[PDB]
Amino acid sequence: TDLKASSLRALKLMHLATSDTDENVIALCHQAKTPVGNTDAIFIYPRFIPIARKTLKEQGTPEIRICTSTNFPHGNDDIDIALAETRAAIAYGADSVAVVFPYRALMAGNEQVGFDLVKACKEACAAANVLLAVIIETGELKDEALIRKASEISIKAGADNIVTSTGKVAVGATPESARIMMEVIRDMGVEKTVGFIPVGGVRTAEDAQKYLAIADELFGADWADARHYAFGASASLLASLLKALG
Ligand SMILES: O=[N+]([O-])c1ccc2[nH]nnc2c1
Secondary structure, three states, X not given: OOHXXXXXXXXXXXXXXXXXXXXXXXXXXHHHEEOOEEOOEEEOOHHHHHXXXXXXXXXXXXXXXXXXXXXXXXXXXXXXXXXXXHHHHHHHOOOEEEEEOOHHHHHOOOOHHHHHHHHHHHHHHHHOOOEEEEEOOHHHHOOHHHHHHHHHHHXXXXXXXXXXXXXXXXXXXXXXXXXXXXXXXXXXXXXXXXXEEOEOOOOOHHHHHHHHHHHHHHHOOOOOOOOOEOEEEEHHHHHHHHHHOO
């Protein structure tokens, strides 16, 4: 009931992903409706959104959200491409669009493109009541200084959520990137409008418990509700969570 309590609460914070074909999206939606309850969302490729929305409706769980990704996984610095992709994500049906920050451009000293890209995508999401999450790719940024700066620029440009990772490079979330990023939320005073999402690095019920207690110590135990905290993860975190719940 410390581990059982936080396992329940983490499972309900999950953004469940594959690991995409039509038959796998389907099984995913089924995977997300568990016997102790539902993850908050699934996370899939935009093309698969209509089919997932249906599967989720048919199975009694319309309230499970559908999150998706754009400029992904590379985080190139073409704004037009990142924006048109975002516009289509929205048109497909997405509740949230996770856009990859142009982190290579920041590493080469250009902060402005990150700012304008995030902001271009936010205006379109906002217009459509879709959340805009920003993946900064901590495992490629690597330096605390760059993790901090990507995070701030994303927030200055209107990110509703900041996310460690794509899940497509070697290093996802670490306790340290996650802390650095949440510290930026705290340091800008934006806890009310910006949530956080580790991707990678949470594999066990005990991991999730650790990551949530970092948010709880920084902001109090009430902060990490589903709007402000998600575990971007896959079937195996979910099975560990469920294992610790019996
Ligand atoms: O922007 N997102 O709401 C969001 C949610 C779950 C994710 N998993 N991986 N990336 C993700 C982005």
